[PDB]
Amino acid sequence: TNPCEKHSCIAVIDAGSTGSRLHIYSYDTDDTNTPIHIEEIWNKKIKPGFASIQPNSVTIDAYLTMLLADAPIHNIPVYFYATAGMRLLPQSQQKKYYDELDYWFRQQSQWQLVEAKTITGNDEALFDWLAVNYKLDTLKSVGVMDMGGASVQIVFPMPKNAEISKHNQVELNIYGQNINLYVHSFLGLGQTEMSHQFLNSPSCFANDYPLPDGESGQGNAPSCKEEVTSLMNSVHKVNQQIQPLLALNPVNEWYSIGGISNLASSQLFHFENSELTNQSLLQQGDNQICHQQWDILNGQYPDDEYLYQYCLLSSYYYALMVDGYGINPNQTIHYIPPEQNLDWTIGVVLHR
Amino acid sequence: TNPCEKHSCIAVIDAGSTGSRLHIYSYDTDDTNTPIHIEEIWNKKIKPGFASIQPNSVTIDAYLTMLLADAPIHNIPVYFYATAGMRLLPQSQQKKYYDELDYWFRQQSQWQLVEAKTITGNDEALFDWLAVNYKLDTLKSVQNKSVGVMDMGGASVQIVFPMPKNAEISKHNQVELNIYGQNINLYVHSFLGLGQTEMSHQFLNSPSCFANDYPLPDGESGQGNAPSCKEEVTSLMNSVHKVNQQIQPLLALNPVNEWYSIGGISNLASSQLFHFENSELTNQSLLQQGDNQICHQQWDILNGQYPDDEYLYQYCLLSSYYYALMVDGYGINPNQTIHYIPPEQNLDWTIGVVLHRA
Numbered sequence: 001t002n003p004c005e006k007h008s009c010i011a012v013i014d015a016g017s018t019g020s021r022l023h024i025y026s027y028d029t030d031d032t033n034t035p036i037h038i039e040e041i042w043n044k045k046i047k048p049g050f051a052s053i054q055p056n057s058v059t060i061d062a063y064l065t066m067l068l069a070d071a072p073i074h075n076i077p078v079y080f081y082a083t084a085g086m087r088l089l090p091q092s093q094q095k096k097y098y099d100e101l102d103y104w105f106r107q108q109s110q111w112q113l114v115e116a117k118t119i120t121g122n123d124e125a126l127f128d129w130l131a132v133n134y135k136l137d138t139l140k141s142v143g144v145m146d147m148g149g150a151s152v153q154i155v156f157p158m159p160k161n162a163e164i165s166k167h168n169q170v171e172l173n174i175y176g177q178n179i180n181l182y183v184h185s186f187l188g189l190g191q192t193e194m195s196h197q198f199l200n201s202p203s204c205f206a207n208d209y210p211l212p213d214g215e216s217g218q219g220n221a222p223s224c225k226e227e228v229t230s231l232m233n234s235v236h237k238v239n240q241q242i243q244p245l246l247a248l249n250p251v252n253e254w255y256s257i258g259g260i261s262n263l264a265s266s267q268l269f270h271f272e273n274s275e276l277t278n279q280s281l282l283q284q285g286d287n288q289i290c291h292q293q294w295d296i297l298n299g300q301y302p303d304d305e306y307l308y309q310y311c312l313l314s315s316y317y318y319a320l321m322v323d324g325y326g327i328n329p330n331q332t333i334h335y336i337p338p339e340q341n342l343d344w345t346i347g348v349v350l351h352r
Numbered sequence: 353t354n355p356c357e358k359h360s361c362i363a364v365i366d367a368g369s370t371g372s373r374l375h376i377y378s379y380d381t382d383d384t385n386t387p388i389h390i391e392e393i394w395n396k397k398i399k400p401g402f403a404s405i406q407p408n409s410v411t412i413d414a415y416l417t418m419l420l421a422d423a424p425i426h427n428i429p430v431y432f433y434a435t436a437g438m439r440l441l442p443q444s445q446q447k448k449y450y451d452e453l454d455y456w457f458r459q460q461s462q463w464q465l466v467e468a469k470t471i472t473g474n475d476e477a478l479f480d481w482l483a484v485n486y487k488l489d490t491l492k493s494v495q496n497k498s499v500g501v502m503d504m505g506g507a508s509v510q511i512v513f514p515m516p517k518n519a520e521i522s523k524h525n526q527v528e529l530n531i532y533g534q535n536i537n538l539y540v541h542s543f544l545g546l547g548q549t550e551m552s553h554q555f556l557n558s559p560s561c562f563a564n565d566y567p568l569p570d571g572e573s574g575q576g577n578a579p580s581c582k583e584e585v586t587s588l589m590n591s592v593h594k595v596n597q598q599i600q601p602l603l604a605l606n607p608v609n610e611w612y613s614i615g616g617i618s619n620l621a622s623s624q625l626f627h628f629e630n631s632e633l634t635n636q637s638l639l640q641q642g643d644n645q646i647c648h649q650q651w652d653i654l655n656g657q658y659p660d661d662e663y664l665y666q667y668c669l670l671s672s673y674y675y676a677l678m679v680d681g682y683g684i685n686p687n688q689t690i691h692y693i694p695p696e697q698n699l700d701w702t703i704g705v706v707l708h709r710a
C-alpha cells in the first residue's frame with residue numbers, strides 16, 4: 001500500500017560529492033503543520049557524485065533516470081539539493097547541470113520538482129543538526145558534525161549574537177521551542193579534498209605504502225596529524241573560528257554522521273556503543289594501520305577499499321576535532337551507525 | 353598524404369587531470385636512433401580528465417573513441433601517460449581504468465599500444481624539461497646558461513632545473529639524462545595537490561580571492577585583494593607543503609638563468625585581461641594586473657562583460673596563487689622574466705616522451 005495516499009510524502013535528493021541519495025519520506029503534521037511521524041519509505045543511492053558527471057543531456061538524463069526508475073511510488077514533490085561537490089564548481093558550470101536537470105524534470109510528469117539548487121554549507125549544517133536531533137528524539141546542548149567528502153559541517157546551540165555573521169546563525173521555532181544555532185561549513189576540508197594535499201606524506205601511510213611520487217610510507221599518526229593541522233589552522237583558521245565559540249557555548253553531547261561512521265564501523269577499528277574518543281581513534285589508526293607493513297596489511301584485509309587511507313583519516317579526524325574545534329581528546333563522540341543511512345535530508349522535511 | 357608515410361610517427365597521449373590531449377609526432381632519427389626534426393602533425397584535445405570518468409567499458413570506450421577515432425593514422429606506437437588526476441587515485445582504482453583501456457586498444461586494428469600507465473610527477477618533470485629544451489634547441493650542446501622549467505598543471509605542479517648529482521638529495525628527485533651525446537643532471541620535484549584545480553578547492557570561501565560581490569559558495573561576498581589572497585595561498589604552499597624550505601636553498605646553490613613555464617598558466621597569461629609582451633610575464637606584473645582587472649572589480653559588471661569566459665571568475669585567485677607558488681614558494685624574483693609558450697603551440701611534456709631514449 002502506498003503511504004502517500006493517506007499521508008504527506010516528499011522526496012529529498014542529497015546530491016553529495018561522492019554520490020546521490022534519494023529518500024522518500026511519509027509524515028503527518030501537528031497543529032502548527034510541522035512534520036511528525038517521519039518515516040523513510042524508500043531509499044536509493046547511486047554513484048558517482050552529480051557534480052562529477054559530464055553536464056550534457058545524455059549523461060544527466062541517464063543519471064536521473066537510473067536514480068528514480070525503481071522507486072515503487074512516484075507523483076510526489078522532489079527537492080534536489082546539491083552540496084560541496086557542486087560548491088566546488090563555478091556558477092557557470094553549475095548552471096549547465098541545473099539547466100539540463102530542470103529540463104529533464106519539466107519534460108516528465110512522474111516527479112514534481114520543487115527546487116533543484118546547490119545549498120550553502122550553512123544550510124546543510126542546519127539540516128544536519130535537525131536530522132540528527134529528529135532521530136535522537138531531542139526535538140521535544142547537542143552538537144552535530146557531518147564529516148563529508150568535500151566539506152565538513154559543525155553546528156551547536158548558541159544565543160543570537162550581533163558580533164557573528166548572520167550567515168552563521170539560525171533561529172528556528174520547532175514544536176513550539178525557540179532554538180538558536182551556530183552553523184559553519186569548511187569547504188575543501190571534507191575527506192577526499194583534504195586527502196589530495198597529503199598523498200606524498202610518508203607519515204600518513206602504512207610502512208612501505210607506495211606513494212604516488214615514488215617514495216615509501218613510514219606511518220606515524222601524530223606526525224600525520226600535525227601536517228593535517230597546518231591545513232586546518234594555518235590555512236582555514238578552524239581553531240580561531242570555532243574554539244572561542246565552543247568555549248562560551250559548551251556542548252554536552254557530540255554526534256557525528258558522514259564518513260567517520262564508515263571508518264569507525266570498519267573491521268580495522270574497534271569501538272563500542274557506536275561511540276569513539278579522538279584519543280582512541282588516533283591510537284587505533286596509528287597502531288593498526290600507520291605502523292604496519294603495507295603489503296602484509298593489504299593482504300590481511302583485502303576487501304576494504306578504504307584501507308590505504310585509514311592512517312591518514314584517523315589522523316585527519318583528530319586534527320579537525322581536537323586541534324581545529326578544540327574538542328577534548330577524551331570526550332565521547334557518538335556516531336550514527338552506517339546501516340541507518342542517515343544524512344541531513346530529514347532536516348529538509350522539517351524546514352520548510 | 354601523411355608525413356607518416358615518409359617519416360617515423362608516434363602518438364603520445366597526455367592524460368591530464370583536466371582533459372586528454374592526443375599528439376602525433378613525425379620525426380627522423382640520427383646515428384644513434386635518437387629522434388630529431390620532431391614535428392607535431394596532429395593534435396586533438398578532449399575534456400574532462402580520464403581519471404574523472406566512471407571506469408566501466410562503455411564510458412572508457414566512448415572516451416577513447418572520441419580521443420582517437422579521427423586521427424589521420426593508427427599503425428603507430430602509442431604511449432598513454434596519465435599524470436596527476438590518476439595519481440589522486442589508489443593503485444586499485446587506477447587498475448580498473450588500465451584494464452579496460454588495454455582491452456579497448458586490443459580491439460583496435462592498428463594502434464600498437466607500447467605503454468599505458470600513470471607516470472610519477474618526477475618523470476613528468478623530466479619530460480617537461482626535455483620538451484621545452486627541445487623547443488629551445490638547447491639539448492645538442494652544453495649550455496652557458498641554466499634553463500629551469502615549470503609545468504603549472506591542474507592537479508600537480510612540476511619544477512625541474514639543472515643540478516650536479518648530489519648524494520645528499522634523494523635519488524628520486526634527481527635524474528641523469530644522456531641525449532644527443534650530452535650528459536645532463538637535473539633536480540625534479542612535483543607537488544601533488546598544488547595544481548590549480550586542487551589548490552583552488554581550499555580557497556573558494558576566501559573573499560580576498562574573488563571579485564567584489566562574487567557569490568562565494570557559502571553565501572558571503574567576494575571582496576578581492578590579490579596580496580591578501582596571495583598570503584592565504586602561501587600558507588598552503590609553505591606552512592603545509594614546505595615548498596620554500598625544499599626549493600629555495602636548491603635554487604640558491606644552482607641558480608637558473610632562464611625560466612620557462614608551460615601548463616595552464618599560458619592560458620591565463622594569454623587572456624585579454626592581461627597585457628604582456630614577447631610571451632613573457634613577471635610575477636609582480638601578473639599579480640598587479642589580476643589585482644586591478646579582477647580582484648578589485650565588481651563581479652556583476654565584469655561577468656556581464658565576459659559572459660562566455662568560464663575561467664575568468666578564478667583569475668584573482670590564480671594570479672595570487674602563481675605569485676605565491678613562484679615567489680613565496682620557489683623564491684623566484686618577482687621581476688624576473690618568466691617565459692610562457694603561446695597556447696596555440698600545444699607544447700606539453702609529450703615531446704619529452706618522443707625523446708625518452710634520454
Ligand SMILES: Nc1ncnc2c1ncn2[C@@H]1O[C@H](COP(=O)(O)OP(=O)(O)NP(=O)(O)O)[C@@H](O)[C@H]1O
Pocket residue numbers: 015016017018019083084085147148149150151152190191192257258259260262263266306313
Ligand atoms: N569505509 C569507509 N571508511 C572511511 N571513509 C569512508 C568509507 N566509505 C566511505 N567513506 C568516505 O566518507 C566520506 C563522507 O562520505 P559522505 O558523507 O557520503 O560524503 P558526501 O555526502 O558524498 N560528501 P559532501 O557533499 O561533502 O557532504 C567520503 O569521503 C567517502 O569517500
Ligand SMILES: Nc1ncnc2c1ncn2[C@@H]1O[C@H](COP(=O)(O)OP(=O)(O)NP(=O)(O)O)[C@@H](O)[C@H]1O
Pocket residue numbers: 367368369370371435436437504505506507508509547548549614615616617619620663
Ligand atoms: N581557455 C582557457 N582560458 C583560461 N584558462 C584555461 C583555459 N583552458 C584551460 N585553462 C586553465 O588551465 C588549467 C589546466 O591546465 P593544464 O596544464 O592543462 O592541466 P592538466 O594537464 O589537465 N593537469 P595535470 O594532470 O596536473 O598536469 C585549467 O583548469 C584551466 O584553469
Ligand SMILES: [Mg+2]
Pocket residue numbers: 016017083148149343
Ligand atoms: Mg554529505
Ligand SMILES: [Mg+2]
Pocket residue numbers: 368369435505506615
Ligand atoms: Mg598537465
